[PDB]
Design a protein around this ligand. Structure first.
Ligand SMILES: [Mg+2]
Ligand SMILES: [Mg+2]
Ligand SMILES: [Mg+2]
Lengths: 433, 432
């Protein structure tokens, strides 16, 4: 049972306030924290902010913390329920909120508490978090995921002209996860040199996700750099490329703009038909095997088209916003074959696990993801393992809000011993391993 | 007694390997990670690296990890010593190393254990970490430190012509530590807007410590930016500026090059006296209240002369390298009046605390420090509090390897309830 719940305001990796919760049980103290996004789809579970302009620019989260300490806490404590009952405790909060998008308490308030409970439940069962999570999702044989490092930030994640948002490297040819870390870290370091020597030292700083933010515009340039770093590191036959366009960030009047960070100019606009032609080039020119949000969150048409031709992975983000309703539609229209799992987009663990299953049962793939605004919390590490998704993207091997996850994953592999199995080339369908 | 010690190779905030230790006792598991400094002093303890230029660019630390699992672990365990015995345990490791700079096992291999022991000890004493540290140090009046956020970077920490390395903002006028975080964050966000409106969006990316590095040359321009961000954020009477010149980086043949990041041209080199005059102006025109490594680590004449001609805080880093011996000479020659405390620079908790008490004993100020290469570990957050140094620099308010420390400090303050104090304008001498 829950003894005491106490939330507070801490700062995420961007310097903005976020929710953190301490949940007490006879087993001990369990703490968790909520991440925050920069490029958020309109259909995302509401994130409740204070709006007090004279404090943190209105980004404060004192209201969400109050809802937790003064309302949610006594509610879950009275329930007498044990922290092991994730599904029950989560519903109680959903019902108490009473809104569809968690607009009364905020998805950040409910999620914080949900995460803390999961951790407490695992302890009550004397099992590591990833084990408890697997039991909740109904899994048995855990599997370490292939990491997708965003080594080159763009869009709203970094200061530069680059339209597209993320350019990732996936060590599918690694021997294990620990080895995958070495490959990604090594390629990343080489990449720093390639950029320094080609664009100068003043271009080796990093963006919100730890990726380098050079001063360029061409989306193919970023792809050439990554391809070079990989080859220069001697991993052409082991590391592939993935990317997140985040078209919704530059959607303007039924036209995708590859230069939104620059003064508005309708002259430099392309249609979804054009935008898709570019990907067909990227997929053939570079070892790209995955493309997230290649179109706008409401451009269902283009999506179903692209997926019908390409044989690679098409990840939905703002299109599905980890929401069963939006997913049902995409599954129906075959708009994509992969789901990006963002827990704070749905607002609770229970729904996130249910959202993952919905994807998997439909033959889709699942990539657990962080938010551009992260914290030292490492929950998603045990999450991706417990759900056996086989793939996670939680930043470049730079900035600890990212490394915290990757380090925890290497510990999980260590903890599994011989039972540790790397997804590898089966990152899309690890159920065969 | 220690039951088990298992070391592993994790990655730091820069993507480079480092040491992490798990220490098991009847009370559970205790983990700690060791940071890695960039511009390190040449006298500090030595960080052991594998040297395999093919693996992690020769930055692997598998060796240090083995020195722990294969040698240290069985040793400390077989001694049956309690984890509350920080000194006896640290010493036992120090002698097992033999060298006077922990080069046999690596300061990182030794510190990893030293930390995990301290955290375990605190659990043994049924006290929070910062309280245990206070008992080991012999302090009772806990106090929160004023945070020093590195907002603008230069020297060898970023890409630009900026000679001086760090430019920090200190919310000495905040109401509490929690409030100090708001002031710092807010100024930080304002600064990013200033740089965007003057140097362009392409100049708002962060460096290793979460700060910005706009392409500029004049160190005065850096000071000007910070001053504007502060005033525009509306905290002119509550936030001061801290400086970290890292002069050793541009010391050249007895002179100094404030443009050393541009093809060597010895015709611009300036003398220590000329440099100190520049500082004097900065202290006059800007709210500079603290300067770290204003001169080369071995330019004693300049340190002592400067310290005797100013009333601001003079911080020794590459000068003292958290080394008792080095500190003794600085004290005796009045080289500086504040010691930068870097735990990995000395190698052990006991020695680190030893170094801090020596400084404070001579009326010195003490500022706890992070390393350009940090981890999710927050030990130093509890350290600066238990040692009552009143000041700590552990990054700008960006990048979690920095926010991790700052958030811990806010918990600690919350944990201290009413009996909680904030150094405030007394960060130089909180002992008052
Ligand atoms: Mg987004
Ligand atoms: Mg996305
Ligand atoms: Mg320094």
């Amino acid at each position: 049972s829950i003894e005491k719940i106490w939330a507070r305001e801490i700062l995420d990796s961007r310097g903005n306030p976020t929710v953190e919760v301490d949940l007490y049980t006879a087993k001990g103290l369990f703490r968790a924290a909520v991440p925050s996004g920069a490029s958020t789809g309109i259909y995302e579970a509401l994130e409740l902010r204070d709006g007090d302009k004279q404090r943190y620019l209105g980004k404060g989260v004192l209201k969400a913390v109050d809802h937790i300490n003064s309302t949610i806490a006594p509610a879950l404590i009275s329930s007498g329920l044990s922290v092991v009952e994730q599904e029950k405790l989560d519903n109680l909060m959903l019902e108490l909120d009473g809104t569809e998008n968690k607009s009364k308490f905020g998805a950040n308030a409910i999620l914080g508490v949900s995460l803390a409970v999961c951790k407490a439940g695992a302890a009550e069962r004397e099992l590591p978090l990833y084990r408890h999570i697997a039991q909740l999702a109904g899994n048995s044989d855990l599997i370490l995921p292939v990491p997708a490092f965003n080594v080159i930030n763009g869009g709203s994640h970094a200061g530069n002209k680059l339209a597209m948002q993320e350019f990732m490297i996936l060590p599918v040819g690694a021997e294990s996860f620990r080895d995958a870390m070495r490959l990604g870290a090594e390629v990343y370091h080489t990449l720093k040199g390639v950029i320094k020597d080609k664009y100068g030292k003043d271009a080796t700083n990093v963006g919100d996700e730890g990726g380098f933010a050079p001063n360029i515009l061409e989306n193919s340039e970023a792809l050439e750099l990554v391809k070079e770093a990989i080859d220069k590191a001697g991993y052409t036959e082991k590391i592939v490329i993935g990317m997140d366009v985040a078209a919704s960030e530059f959607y303007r009047d039924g036209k995708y703009d590859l230069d939104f960070k620059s003064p508005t100019d309708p002259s430099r606009y392309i249609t979804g038909d054009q935008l898709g032609a570019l990907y067909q080039d990227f997929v053939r020119d570079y070892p790209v095997v995955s493309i997230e949000d290649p179109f706008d969150q409401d451009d269902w048409a283009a999506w179903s088209k692209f997926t019908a031709n390409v044989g690679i992975q098409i990840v939905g983000d703002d299109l599905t916003v980890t929401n069963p309703k939006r997913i049902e539609r995409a599954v129906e229209e075959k708009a994509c074959n992969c789901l990006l799992l963002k827990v704070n987009q749905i607002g609770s663990v229970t729904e996130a696990i249910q959202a993952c299953k919905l994807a998997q049962e439909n033959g889709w793939g699942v990539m657990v993801s962080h938010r551009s605004g992260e914290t030292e919390d490492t929950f998603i590490a045990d999450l991706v393992v417990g759900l056996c998704t086989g793939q996670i993207k939680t930043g470049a091997p730079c900035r600890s809000e990212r490394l915290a996850k990757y380090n925890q994953l290497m510990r999980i592999e260590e903890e599994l011993g011989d039972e540790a199995r790397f997804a590898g080339h089966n990152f899309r369908n690890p159920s065969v391993l």
